[PDB]
């Protein structure tokens, strides 16, 4: 993990396959593999210390276009998951907000116009739900009811 | 160690002058199969000395040959089965074999194994009337009806244990009621597994039913009259 280059090659394992269908080394790499993987490294290094909106702003796509893209994409993700789940193949796991990343998204570069996941649903889920206005401030509410301590019965007797 | 870089080992120190010409000294014997089969003629086999008539006879008594039931039985589908024939008599450029065992073939077993259904395996040890001791292995996979909608058809283990006991009963009553030619003629056209299917259709309908393997374990004292009878002694010609 403290190594700097094995783990980099693990991270851009997918782009290299995608755009060279070896030359993992960053001084024989050529073409759109070189371009995209540089965009990768710069985003990671800046992500640890920049602010969330400016480190990943999305390009502008009108509404029906972007909704259409995400819909078609999610059907492709679920086809993949169904085919593996049937003919039982393990799949790497994803934090259940995020879109699973597959070889079609690495090729189409659809992450720049879709995003990691639907940010509105992310934020709205990660809020905590709002409690009521609270009233009876003398005892503890249990499954059985208000337990009212002897000391408090004394203090307001 | 062929090449020029390859160093000597203890290896090529004392060699042997190959002079003997083994495939001059050898001799060819024709073999032949019992009378329960169609294409009786098969095979020629070598004997490592000719100059032992009795020594040659000892080698050919020892032998075990095995052959595809297709070419043994006319039907040119290589019917995925093997007959081991054992040679236990000699007479004059003819070996008079006898039945020794049987097996399916691993590609046929892969050809039947399937995922959403269980297999049933019975393996009964029996005795024929000729005092041979047999071990017969029989296999059967459960099936879905001509009607179902559930996606998989598994047998509850009551049904499995009643099927295994039923298969055991049919096998042991049929082979104890056989003699060894009577067995072989039963085994050739696959009539046992119709008996199994017809007697197990009342439990949980099986599809794919077979007599997988037969292992011989015991033979009696050898029986020349019986064997030459099963196949079905001679003047010389007066060298002067």
């Amino acid at each position: 993990q403290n190594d700097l280059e094995l783990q980099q090659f693990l991270r851009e394992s997918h782009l290299l396959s995608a755009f060279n269908n070896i030359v993992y080394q960053d001084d024989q790499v050529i073409g759109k593999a070189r371009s995209r993987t540089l965009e990768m490294r710069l985003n990671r290094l800046s992500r640890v210390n920049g602010h969330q909106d400016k480190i990943n702003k999305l390009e502008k796509v009108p509404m029906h276009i972007r909704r259409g893209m995400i819909d078609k994409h999610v059907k492709r993700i679920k086809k993949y998951e169904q085919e593996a789940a049937e003919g039982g193949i393990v799949l790497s796991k994803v934090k259940k907000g995020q879109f699973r990343k597959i070889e079609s998204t690495y090729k189409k570069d659809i992450e720049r116009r879709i995003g990691g996941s639907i940010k509105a649903r992310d934020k709205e889920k990660a809020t905590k739900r709002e409690r009521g206005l609270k009233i009876s401030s003398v005892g503890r509410s249990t499954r059985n009811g208000l337990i009212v301590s002897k000391r408090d019965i004394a203090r307001i007797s | 160690a062929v090449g020029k870089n390859k160093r000597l080992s203890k290896g090529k120190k004392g060699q042997k002058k190959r002079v003997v010409d083994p495939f001059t000294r050898k001799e060819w014997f024709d073999i032949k199969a019992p009378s329960t089969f169609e294409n009786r003629n098969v095979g020629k086999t070598l004997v490592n000395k000719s100059t032992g008539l009795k020594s040659a006879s000892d080698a050919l008594k020892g032998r075990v040959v095995e052959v595809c039931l297709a070419d043994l039985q006319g039907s040119e589908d290589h019917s995925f089965r093997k007959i081991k024939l054992r040679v236990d008599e000699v007479q004059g450029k003819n070996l008079l074999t006898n039945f020794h065992g049987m097996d399916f073939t691993t590609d046929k077993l892969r050809s039947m194994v399937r995922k959403w259904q269980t297999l049933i395996e019975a393996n009964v040890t029996v005795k024929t009337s000729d005092d041979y001791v047999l071990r017969i292995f029989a296999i059967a996979f459960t099936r879905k009806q001509a009607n179902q909608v559930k996606r998989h058809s598994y047998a509850q283990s009551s049904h499995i244990r009643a099927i295994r006991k039923v298969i055991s009963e049919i096998l042991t009553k049929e082979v104890q009621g056989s003699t060894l030619a009577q067995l072989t003629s039963k085994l050739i056209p696959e009539v046992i597994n119709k008996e199994i299917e017809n007697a197990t259709k009342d439990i949980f309908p099986l599809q794919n039913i077979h007599v997988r393997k037969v292992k011989l374990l015991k033979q009696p004292k050898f029986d020349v009259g019986a064997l030459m009878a099963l196949h079905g002694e001679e003047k010389g010609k007066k060298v002067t």
Binding site: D3, L6, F9, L10, R11, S13, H14, L16, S17, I22, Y24, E83, E86, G87, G88, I89, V90, L91, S92, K93, K101 | E76, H78, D107, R110, S111, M112, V113, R114, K115, W116, R151
Partner: protein
């Protein structure tokens, strides 16, 4: 003459019924006839009277093996080529603790699939982890490497060690018991009794 048959499940039945025409035109380029049974759920390859590659009957057998193991059709015909063999690796019998076993399998696939994909690139193979069998395809030396790394992953060596090792190798190649239990402590009530 010779023929080999295998069986597939119904999801592959729909997929196969699409791709089948490319199979018969590829195998007839090699002169091998084939047939698909939706009635029983099988696939059969036969040689014909005009074929003459006795190895191709074994390779095409293995083609239908892969397609019913749900490897898609482009990777099937890569089995049909000459310097490629498939391989099934068993991983059922390496540990008992099932939690531990599932963790080790997922260690082989790894975050986003990275370790599997990086072995795929460094060994030119095509790996498919299923259940208890890791089915790979590739050139034979690739299969040597895969068997070593998957086996020691199911034993306790991290595949990331074997990936580092492969990368460097390639660079240099360029250069008392009782059964009766004790008594029971009595309750306060029964003590009062």
């Amino acid at each position: 003459e010779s023929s080999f048959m295998t069986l597939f499940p119904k999801y592959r039945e729909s997929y196969l019924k699409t791709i089948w025409n490319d199979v018969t035109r590829a195998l007839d380029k090699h002169n091998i006839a084939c047939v698909l049974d939706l009635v029983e759920g099988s696939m059969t390859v036969k040689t014909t009277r005009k074929t003459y590659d006795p190895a191709i009957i074994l390779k095409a057998r293995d083609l239908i093996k892969l397609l019913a193991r749900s490897v898609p059709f482009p990777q099937a015909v890569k089995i049909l080529q000459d310097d490629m063999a498939c391989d099934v690796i068993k991983i059922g019998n390496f540990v008992t603790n099932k939690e531990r076993f599932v963790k080790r399998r997922q260690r082989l696939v790894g975050p986003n699939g990275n370790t599997l994909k990086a072995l795929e690139l460094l060994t030119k193979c095509y790996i498919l982890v299923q259940g208890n069998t890791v089915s790979a395809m590739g050139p034979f030396k690739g299969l040597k490497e895969v068997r070593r790394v998957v086996e020691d992953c199911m034993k306790n060596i991290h595949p990331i060690y074997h990936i580092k090792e492969l990368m460097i190798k390639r660079e240099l190649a360029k250069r008392v018991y009782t059964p009766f239990p004790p008594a029971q402590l009595p309750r306060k009530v029964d003590l009062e009794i």
